[PDB]
């Protein structure tokens, strides 16, 4: 019975990833004064099916100079970590109701970097090494500020449980008292997933393709669905953190519709940002978070740890 629950969790997110490829292509085309795919089917509904069937009947092309074991393990680890880290999200009831879901998602987001790193190192190429080291630089740029942002915004919730975050935002949204943390969190989620303007790993300008330049079709699709499932999970995580919707225990479909449309708007905002900005340099991103975001994050952390004591508004931990 739990098998039914986990398969009904993991199949619609793959379908969502494919239709996210469709929506990304069509919306990005329409923002560039042109049209997206509409010839494959009725309004292009069959383009992701054609892409998926095409990519799984092509040659795998395992290189000779690459360590084959890590070359196979890295996309498997990427897709796996993209799968078993959707679980603690309350929709409105999570599949796994972890007591420490926030730290779990932090740890498994730290673990997903190793797939990119071992993909870059395993395939014996210089561009893959450059992409892997740029991923390392991006991780050391963003991780500490991301964790302090989460700690400062969880001081009003009471605990690390993601299920109690709806109860915290039952009266008002959490973006009203923590909007600078919300903006910094949005930039951190943009830089976490290597999305534009902080791509810097699959750079088609400075490099050819980066870490996945030696990965032909079949294994290359795994990184694509891992990245797109990652951006959907960041959108849902940001929606739960800062845009908590009204929850009725008798009608969970209201909360499901509400956070579904909010996460869709957040993904639309992601693609809106993608089409409009030039790519950051990966040394400028390093000085962005470590010099501008970090002092403000420390000041806001001290403000948010001295605020509930000041106002007799310390939230319960139960």
């Amino acid at each position: 019975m739990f098998m039914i629950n986990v398969l009904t969790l993991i199949i619609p997110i793959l379908l969502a990833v494919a239709f996210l490829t469709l929506v990304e292509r069509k919306v990005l085309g329409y923002m560039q004064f042109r049209k997206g795919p509409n010839v494959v089917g009725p309004y292009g509904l069959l383009q992701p099916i054609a892409d998926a069937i095409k990519l799984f009947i092509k040659e795998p092309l395992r290189p000779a100079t690459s360590s084959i074991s890590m070359f196979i393990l890295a996309p498997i680890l990427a897709l796996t970590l993209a799968l078993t880290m959707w679980i603690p999200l309350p929709m409105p009831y999570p599949l796994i109701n972890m007591n420490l879901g926030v730290l779990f998602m932090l740890a498994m987001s730290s673990l997903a970097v190793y797939s990119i790193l071992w993909s870059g190192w395993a395939s014996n190429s210089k561009y893959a090494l450059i992409g892997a080291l740029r991923a390392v630089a991006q991780t050391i740029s963003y991780e500490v500020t991301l964790a302090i942002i989460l700690l400062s915004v969880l001081l009003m919730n009471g605990s690390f449980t993601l299920s109690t975050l709806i109860i915290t935002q039952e009266q008002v949204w959490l973006i009203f008292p923590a909007w600078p943390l919300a903006m910094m969190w949005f930039i951190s989620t943009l830089a976490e997933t290597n999305r534009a303007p902080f791509d810097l790993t699959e750079g088609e300008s400075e490099l050819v393709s980066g870490f996945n330049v030696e990965y032909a079709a079949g294994p290359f699709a795994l990184f694509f669905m891992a990245e797109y499932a990652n951006i959907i999970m960041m959108n849902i995580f940001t929606t739960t953190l800062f845009l908590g919707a009204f929850h009725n225990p008798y009608m969970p479909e209201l909360y499901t519709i509400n956070f579904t449309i909010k996460s869709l708007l957040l993904s639309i905002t992601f693609l809106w940002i993608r089409a409009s900005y030039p790519r950051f340099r990966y040394d400028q991103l390093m000085h962005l978070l470590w010099k501008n975001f970090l002092p403000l994050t420390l000041a806001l952390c001290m403000w948010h740890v001295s605020l509930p004591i000041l106002l007799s508004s310390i939230p319960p931990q139960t």
Partner: protein, 70 residues
């Protein structure tokens, strides 16, 4: 004869200058809006957190009443 020529009065005006309309508010307005939003959020959070503390105290004293039988 018939050739491609401009008319007697010439053509209309053609622009060649940079046009940036400078749309938006001053810094004081947006900073005051942000401060007001922060104050409203802080007040709502203080009220809801006090209510949640009272509810937690009620649940704890319910457990206190239920303890000896268990």
């Amino acid at each position: 004869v018939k050739q491609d020529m401009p008319p007697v009065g010439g053509y209309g005006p053609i622009d060649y200058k940079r046009n940036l309309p400078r749309r938006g508010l001053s810094g004081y307005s947006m900073f005051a809006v942000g401060i007001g939003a922060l104050l409203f959020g802080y007040w709502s959070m203080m009220r809801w957190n006090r209510e949640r503390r009272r509810l937690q105290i009620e649940d704890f004293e319910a457990r206190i009443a239920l303890m000896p039988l268990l």
